[PDB]
RNA sequence: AAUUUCUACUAAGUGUAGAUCGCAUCCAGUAAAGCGGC
DNA sequence: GCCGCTTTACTGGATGCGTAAAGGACG
DNA sequence: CGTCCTTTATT
């Protein structure tokens, strides 16, 4: 009611409506006969090609400067960049330095005198014909001699590359804003970690990577940046961090690889380096050597047959390798060795059937010498055997035969396994013989052929496992005696079997690539700017315009031969007529009023006083230090008079300008032109003539259509279908404008009609909803699946502009604060993320009362009494594992972004419904860049998509049921978030949306506000001794069977935050602990009081003795304290959760509230309408919402001039005094 | 199981409900398999 | 599980445009 | 000389 109505007509944004275009009458017949589509098809392919050559020239022009660029005073930027103490004056000083560094790069591209010609028709007619040396590339640019405006959008994408501003697509942005900070940040890390770099490691990287031409320390000096400005330098720089791969496959290690080895050997966390991003428009060949993938299906086959058949060496390698293990007994059992790795536990199984016997057998050997009888099994003796067992490089066949008990002979059972595994491979060929024949011809493309691939994948994985098994027998020796008679033959075969490793690589990279599909192609109809705008004065120029015949809108296109065929038409008084558009638009008043009145054609006709042309030149009409008021007034009066004397503007638009003496700036004037320089009207044009123009092929005509436009549809239209209707409805006083830049694509069919899944007519189809009481539909017509891709389809993308002239101008975050300061019962929505519930909603009133809370794991909807509850969290979990198991098995990877998107729209709808009902602000978690990472497989990508599509909705929120001409409807939709420019331009609040920190949101007691601010991990006995003494009392309360731990927080460290300070903790309830190593459960439920009684009996403590603090401190045993502090750890462990278990995720508190009862969320999850959180997840969203109620409390005090300056970012100390006082 | 398109439907018979900014460019991120060092 | 190289997939953020009339070249 | 494709102007 009150709050939302204020937010209408707030700002201007554009959207795009999409429509299927259906050819009318003989339209498509004439389009085929004139071969128009094949020309645009052949063009859209050549258009990608010409662009590729254009990139070649740009990259060449890009590099001429970037090779030769020198950055002035680079150290100065570095100096202020690494200062731990800049002021509000030096912070503005480094920025002005950062701006000049990009300018230094930017003007060097523009300093060239060929710069401006890179984006005009000259580059295609002139420059590229000179640069190119191919006679075919010369011929593909010539066909575009007539179309150079079809590149205007491509040229804009390339001037961004030469921008000076901090823009993401700028080259200057890449080198300075991105590469420098990454380069500087590593310079801070190099110095910190330079100590751990061996002198050979410096020489290793210098000889192998740097070629002795540069020192390694050089690439961390300030002045050496100039090398890395190109891809040539970046490729070398990244190699210093990561290393690279030679021809022979040697993994040359980089600095990030060495720092890693040191931190695994000294158990530290020293920082690794950040690689550098690529340079814009670089075609980057990678330094690491890799064998190129196969181009086509035929190559893959010819390799597969020739390399993998029995005749080829790869089989001969196995054929001889089987011979070696057969005669295995002959060679010296001291000469053969089995490598040591974690993969040997499998080896122990293959001989005698147990994993850990080889480890256990050896452990008996190491123990007996180095187990003195005093200890029997100290932690140091058990833990040192692990150090020795992996340090061992390999095992000889006799140390394994010595471990083996008779009659088991290791050398014989080795012959058994190899004989078992090479028999398997000879049988996979039996199935795959159909792949090896010379005659075999593939039925379907390799990607469309899941049946042939699974055959190759099965033969390749069978060869891979036999080779991967044998690799362990090398032993990496470096061994005193090797039966080199054996290993000589072995090395000969195994290096040749190693050839499959490159085939396994390259085949995977071919088969698993998405198959060929024909993208839709833009239709030009022989005009480079086809259908660019709708102005009636341009109808001949663009050659397309819109037509209306009642409830149906058509798109008419005029053939190049008959450009003015729809202008000679007139009204037919008696017979049918079309409604023809009369579109009129004045784009860019700041760029169209001076462009015309100072243009060569009209500069004479309107003789601007020499005073004028010196005002526009000096820019005194602009606000700032050049600003003059009367000059602005005079510039206005010249434009005003000139328009009245301009015919095609004055007649077309009805102009009302307020008195020039009332304009405060030139912007106020241009706005009135813009708001009134748009008029859409309709004229009458004969149908029998226009239709004659379609049959004659002089005019092409499609119907604009979606399923709402069907005569069989009686249901609520799609939201965009409403927009389309308002564009031409006479109640749209400019709210939604018809913008230019429409496009028309052609998407050829991608599926065959005969191939489709069809539900045959008059045969019953089963309904999937178990709530739907009609489990069958019997239709009299066929239901083809994906029928929209079974036929060719025209596409029409029409951009629209909403609120191009915004009336209501004010700050939105400020206006939201204003109405919160005055709302008597404001509401807050709390939305909390999780991995057990994707999203949890909590709605609260101004007093923190819960009105609503439910999980959004499932979307529940009712229409006409037909409930349907979709389990989207299950749908996401199943599609995720349908891509995981797809990636493993080389099959098709299903798409999941749409499933997440379809979920959010159902979610977004629900929040907007809550926002409309309760007039509630929205509360989200303050998440920076780091939190996106997780330890388990996330759908938390849904959360990032949840904000984007929710913010996008709140930019222009509409209800499709309200009247469009009413507030909230289609023409007056609510705008309650700041315009979405980027995710990085965001602050702590965005209109109704508040991002708030999550500290103490979940592990806090709702009933009392109690929080765990004690550190309980065990460090020493004395630390434990001081701990127990600090508590006011530790007693047993027998009437309740509980232990009581009264404390004043001021006796512990870092308890400054808490308000109440004095709490009494009780060992009430059970907790959940996770194991550290068969067993039914990986967790147990400890009973605290039944465990304090347990601990206190093991050490002989009389816990009934009143106060027990001095009694527990009397102990001298470390084991007592290391477990006591553990029991103390669980009592303060409020949030108890278990991975992947639906049952467990509960919050329980060890404090009695005002009525002396503990908060156990389980006592709430059973309730339908609970007044407190039901679980740790709802507890999160509840508090996220209350943290915002605190902020509303700060708005109710401050005054509207200072409401903008209130800090809504909670202080961790302020939130505790609030959570403890609210109850 | 239809769709401008996506999702979920069949929703009373060629459809229902919700959502939907297209296009081009630069760049990055995640997952998987192989490959080398701990 | 950490570090690094590759290849395939699918996915996502940040930029530009959403223009009529002047301007010029051309048969 | 009219027609079609190119460049332009910046609250
Ligand atoms: Mg509908
Ligand atoms: Mg995934």
From TrEMBL:
<dbReference type="InterPro" id="IPR054116">
    <property type="entry name" value="Cas12a_REC2"/>
</dbReference>
<feature type="region of interest" description="Binds crRNA alone and in crRNA-target DNA heteroduplex">
    <location>
        <begin position="47"/>
        <end position="51"/>
    </location>
</feature>
<feature type="active site" description="For DNase activity of RuvC domain">
    <location>
        <position position="1177"/>
    </location>
</feature>
<feature type="site" description="Binds crRNA alone and in crRNA-target DNA heteroduplex">
    <location>
        <position position="16"/>
    </location>
</feature>
<feature type="region of interest" description="Binds crRNA">
    <location>
        <begin position="719"/>
        <end position="720"/>
    </location>
</feature>
<feature type="site" description="Binds DNA in crRNA-target DNA heteroduplex">
    <location>
        <position position="272"/>
    </location>
</feature>
<feature type="domain" description="Cas12a REC1">
    <location>
        <begin position="49"/>
        <end position="280"/>
    </location>
</feature>
<feature type="region of interest" description="Binds DNA in crRNA-target DNA heteroduplex">
    <location>
        <begin position="256"/>
        <end position="260"/>
    </location>
</feature>
<feature type="active site" description="For pre-crRNA processing">
    <location>
        <position position="759"/>
    </location>
</feature>
<feature type="site" description="Binds PAM">
    <location>
        <position position="595"/>
    </location>
</feature>
<feature type="region of interest" description="Binds crRNA">
    <location>
        <begin position="707"/>
        <end position="710"/>
    </location>
</feature>
<feature type="coiled-coil region">
    <location>
        <begin position="77"/>
        <end position="107"/>
    </location>
</feature>
<dbReference type="InterPro" id="IPR040852">
    <property type="entry name" value="RuvC_1"/>
</dbReference>
<dbReference type="InterPro" id="IPR027620">
    <property type="entry name" value="Cas12a"/>
</dbReference>
<feature type="domain" description="Cas12a REC2">
    <location>
        <begin position="296"/>
        <end position="512"/>
    </location>
</feature>
<dbReference type="Pfam" id="PF18510">
    <property type="entry name" value="NUC"/>
</dbReference>
<feature type="region of interest" description="Binds crRNA">
    <location>
        <begin position="516"/>
        <end position="520"/>
    </location>
</feature>
<feature type="site" description="Binds Target strand DNA; via amide nitrogen">
    <location>
        <position position="740"/>
    </location>
</feature>
<dbReference type="Pfam" id="PF22222">
    <property type="entry name" value="Cpf1_PI-like"/>
</dbReference>
<feature type="active site" description="For DNase activity of RuvC domain">
    <location>
        <position position="925"/>
    </location>
</feature>
<feature type="site" description="Binds DNA in crRNA-target DNA heteroduplex">
    <location>
        <position position="514"/>
    </location>
</feature>
<dbReference type="Pfam" id="PF21918">
    <property type="entry name" value="cas_Cpf1_2nd"/>
</dbReference>
<feature type="active site" description="For DNase activity of RuvC domain">
    <location>
        <position position="832"/>
    </location>
</feature>
<feature type="active site" description="For pre-crRNA processing">
    <location>
        <position position="768"/>
    </location>
</feature>
<feature type="active site" description="For pre-crRNA processing">
    <location>
        <position position="785"/>
    </location>
</feature>
<dbReference type="Pfam" id="PF18501">
    <property type="entry name" value="REC1"/>
</dbReference>
<protein>
    <submittedName>
        <fullName>LbCas12a</fullName>
    </submittedName>
</protein>
<feature type="domain" description="Cas12a PI">
    <location>
        <begin position="587"/>
        <end position="678"/>
    </location>
</feature>
<feature type="region of interest" description="Binds crRNA in crRNA-target DNA heteroduplex">
    <location>
        <begin position="278"/>
        <end position="281"/>
    </location>
</feature>
<feature type="site" description="Binds crRNA">
    <location>
        <position position="747"/>
    </location>
</feature>
<keyword id="KW-0175">Coiled coil</keyword>
<feature type="domain" description="Cas12a RuvC nuclease">
    <location>
        <begin position="810"/>
        <end position="1222"/>
    </location>
</feature>
<feature type="region of interest" description="Binds crRNA alone and in crRNA-target DNA heteroduplex">
    <location>
        <begin position="154"/>
        <end position="158"/>
    </location>
</feature>
<dbReference type="InterPro" id="IPR040882">
    <property type="entry name" value="Cas12a_NUC"/>
</dbReference>
<feature type="site" description="Binds Target strand DNA">
    <location>
        <position position="591"/>
    </location>
</feature>
<dbReference type="Pfam" id="PF18516">
    <property type="entry name" value="RuvC_1"/>
</dbReference>
<dbReference type="InterPro" id="IPR040787">
    <property type="entry name" value="Cas12a_REC1"/>
</dbReference>
<feature type="domain" description="Cas12a nuclease">
    <location>
        <begin position="1004"/>
        <end position="1163"/>
    </location>
</feature>
<feature type="binding site">
    <location>
        <position position="716"/>
    </location>
    <ligand>
        <name>Mg(2+)</name>
    </ligand>
</feature>
<feature type="site" description="Binds DNA in crRNA-target DNA heteroduplex">
    <location>
        <position position="286"/>
    </location>
</feature>
<dbReference type="InterPro" id="IPR053993">
    <property type="entry name" value="Cas12a_PI"/>
</dbReference>
<feature type="region of interest" description="Binds crRNA">
    <location>
        <begin position="781"/>
        <end position="789"/>
    </location>
</feature>
């Amino acid at each position: 009611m009150s709050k939302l109505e204020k937010f209408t007509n707030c700002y201007s944004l554009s959207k795009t409506l999409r429509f299927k275009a259906i050819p009318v009458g003989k339209t498509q017949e004439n389009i085929d006969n004139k071969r128009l589509l094949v020309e645009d098809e052949k063009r859209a392919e050549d258009y990608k090609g010409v662009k590729k050559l254009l990139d070649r020239y740009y990259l060449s022009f890009i590099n001429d400067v970037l090779h030769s660029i020198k950055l002035k005073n680079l150290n100065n930027y570095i100096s202020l960049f690494r200062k731990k103490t800049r002021t509000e004056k030096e912070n503005k000083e480094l920025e002005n330095l950062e701006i000049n560094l990009r300018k230094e790069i930017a003007k060097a591209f523009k300093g060239n005198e060929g710069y401006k010609s890179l984006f005009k028709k000259d580059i295609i007619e002139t420059i590229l014909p000179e640069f190119l040396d191919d006679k075919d590339e010369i011929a593909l640019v010539n066909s575009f001699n007539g179309f150079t405006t079809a590149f205007t959008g491509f040229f804009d994408n390339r001037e961004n590359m030469f921008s000076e501003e901090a823009k993401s697509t700028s080259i200057a942005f890449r080198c300075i804003n991105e590469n420098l900070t990454r380069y500087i940040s590593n310079m801070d890390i190099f110095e910190k970690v330079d100590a751990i770099f061996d002198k050979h490691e410096v020489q290793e990287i210098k000889e192998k990577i740097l070629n002795s031409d540069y020192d390694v320390e050089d690439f961390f000096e300030g002045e050496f940046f100039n090398f890395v400005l190109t891809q040539e330098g970046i490729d070398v720089y990244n190699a210093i961090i990561g290393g690279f791969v030679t021809e022979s496959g040697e993994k040359i290690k980089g600095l990030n690889e060495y720092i890693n080895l040191y931190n695994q050997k000294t158990k530290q966390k020293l920082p690794k380096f950040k690689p550098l991003y690529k340079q814009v428009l670089s075609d980057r060949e990678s330094l690491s050597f890799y064998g190129e993938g196969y181009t086509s299906d035929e190559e893959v086959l010819e390799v597969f047959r020739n390399t993998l058949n029995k005749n080829s060496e790869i089989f001969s390698s196995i054929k001889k390798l089987e011979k070696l293990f057969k005669n295995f007994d002959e060679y010296s059992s001291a000469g053969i060795f089995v490598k040591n790795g974690p993969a040997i536990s499998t080896i122990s199984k293959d001989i005698f059937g147990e994993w850990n016997v080889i480890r256990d057998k050896w452990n008996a050997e190491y123990d007996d010498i180095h187990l003195k009888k005093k200890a029997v099994v100290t932690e140091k003796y058990e833990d040192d055997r692990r150090k020795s067992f992996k340090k061992i490089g390999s095992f000889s066949l006799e140390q394994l035969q010595e471990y083996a008990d008779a009659d088991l002979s290791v050398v014989e059972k080795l012959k058994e396994i190899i004989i078992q595994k090479v028999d398997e491979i000879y049988k996979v060929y039996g199935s795959s013989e159909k792949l090896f024949d010379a005659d075999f011809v593939l039925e379907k493309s390799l990607k469309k052929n899941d049946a042939v691939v699974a055959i190759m994948k099965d033969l390749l994985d069978s060869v891979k496992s036999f080779e991967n098994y044998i690799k362990a027998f090398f032993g990496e020796g470096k061994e005193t005696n090797r039966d080199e008679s054996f290993y000589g033959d072995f090395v000969l075969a195994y290096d040749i079997l190693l050839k499959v490793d490159h085939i396994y690589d390259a085949i995977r990279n071919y088969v698993t690539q998405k198959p060929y599909s024909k993208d839709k192609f833009k239709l030009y109809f022989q005009n480079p700017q086809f259908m660019g705008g709708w102005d009636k004065d341009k109808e001949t120029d663009y050659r397309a315009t819109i037509l209306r015949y009642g409830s149906k809108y058509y798109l008419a296109i005029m053939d190049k031969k008959y450009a003015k065929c729809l202008q000679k038409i007139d009204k037919d008084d008696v017979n049918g007529n079309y409604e023809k558009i009369n579109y009129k638009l004045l784009p860019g008043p700041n760029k169209m009023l001076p462009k015309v009145f100072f243009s060569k054609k009209w500069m004479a006709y309107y003789n601007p006083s020499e005073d004028i042309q010196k005002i526009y030149k000096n820019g005194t009409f602009k606000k700032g230090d050049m600003f003059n008021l009367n000059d602005c007034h005079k510039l206005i009066d010249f434009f005003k008079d000139s328009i009245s004397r301009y015919p095609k503007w004055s007649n077309a638009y009805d102009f009302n300008f307020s008195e020039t003496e009332k304009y405060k700036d030139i912007a106020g004037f241009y706005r009135e032109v813009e708001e009134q320089g748009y008029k859409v009207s309709f004229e009458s044009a004969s149908k029998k003539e226009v239709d004659k123009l379609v049959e004659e092929g002089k005019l092409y005509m499609f119907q604009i259509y979606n399923k709402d436009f069907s005569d069989k549809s009686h249901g609520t239209p799609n939201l965009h279908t409403m927009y389309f209707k308002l564009l031409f409805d006479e109640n749209n006083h400019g709210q939604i404008r018809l913008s230019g830049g429409a496009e028309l694509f052609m998407r050829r069919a991608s599926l065959k009609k005969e191939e489709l899944v069809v539900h045959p007519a008059n045969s019953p189809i089963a309904n999937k909803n178990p709530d739907n009481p009609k489990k069958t539909t019997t239709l009299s017509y066929d239901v083809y699946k994906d029928k929209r891709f079974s036929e060719d389809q025209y596409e029409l993308h029409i951009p629209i502009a909403i609120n191009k002239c915004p009336k209501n101008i004010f700050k939105i975050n400020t206006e939201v604060r204003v109405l919160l300061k005055h709302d008597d019962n404001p509401y807050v929505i709390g939305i909390d993320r999780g991995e057990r519930n994707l999203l949890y909603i909590v709605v609260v009133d101004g007093k923190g009362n819960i009105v609503e809370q439910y999980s959004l794991n499932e979307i529940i909807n009712n229409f006409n009494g037909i409930r349907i509850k979709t389990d989207y969290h299950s749908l996401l979990d199943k599609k995720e594992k349908e891509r995981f198991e797809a990636r493993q098995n080389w099959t098709s990877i299903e798409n999941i972004k749409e499933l997440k998107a379809g979920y959010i729209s159902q979610v977004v709808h629900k929040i907007c419904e809550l926002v409309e009902k309760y007039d509630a602000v929205i509360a989200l978690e303050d998440l920076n860049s780091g939190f996106k990472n997780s330890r388990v497989k996330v759908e938390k990508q849904v959360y990032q998509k949840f904000e984007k599509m929710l913010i996008d909705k709140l930019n222009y929120m509409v209800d499709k049921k309200s009247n469009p001409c009413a507030t909230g409807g289609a023409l007056k939709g609510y705008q309650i978030t700041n315009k979405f420019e980027s995710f990085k331009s965001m602050s702590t609040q965005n209109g109704f949306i508040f991002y708030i920190p999550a500290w103490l949101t979940s592990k806090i007691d709702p009933s009392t506000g109690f929080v765990n601010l004690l550190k309980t991990k065990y460090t020493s006995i004395a630390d434990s001794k001081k701990f127990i003494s600090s508590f006011d009392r530790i007693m047993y309360v027998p009437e309740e069977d509980l232990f009581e731990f009264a404390l004043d927080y001021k006796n512990f460290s870092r308890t400054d935050a808490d308000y109440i300070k004095k709490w009494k903790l009780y060992s009430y309830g059970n907790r959940i602990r996770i194991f550290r190593n068969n067993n039914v459960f990986d967790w147990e439920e400890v009973c605290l009081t039944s465990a304090y009684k347990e601990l206190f009996n093991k050490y002989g403590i009389n816990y009934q003795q009143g106060d027990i603090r001095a009694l527990l401190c009397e102990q001298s045993d470390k084991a007592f304290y290391s477990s006591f502090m553990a029991l103390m750890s669980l009592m303060l462990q409020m949030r108890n959760s278990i991975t992947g278990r639906t049952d467990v995720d509960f919050l329980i508190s060890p404090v009695k509230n005002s009525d002396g009862i503990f908060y156990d969320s389980r006592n709430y999850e059973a309730q339908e309408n609970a007044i407190l959180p039901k679980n740790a997840d709802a507890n999160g969203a509840y508090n996220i919402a209350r943290k915002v109620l605190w902020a509303i409390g700060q708005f109710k005090k401050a005054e509207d001039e200072k409401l903008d300056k209130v800090k809504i970012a909670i202080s961790n100390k302020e939130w505790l005094e609030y959570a403890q006082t609210s109850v």
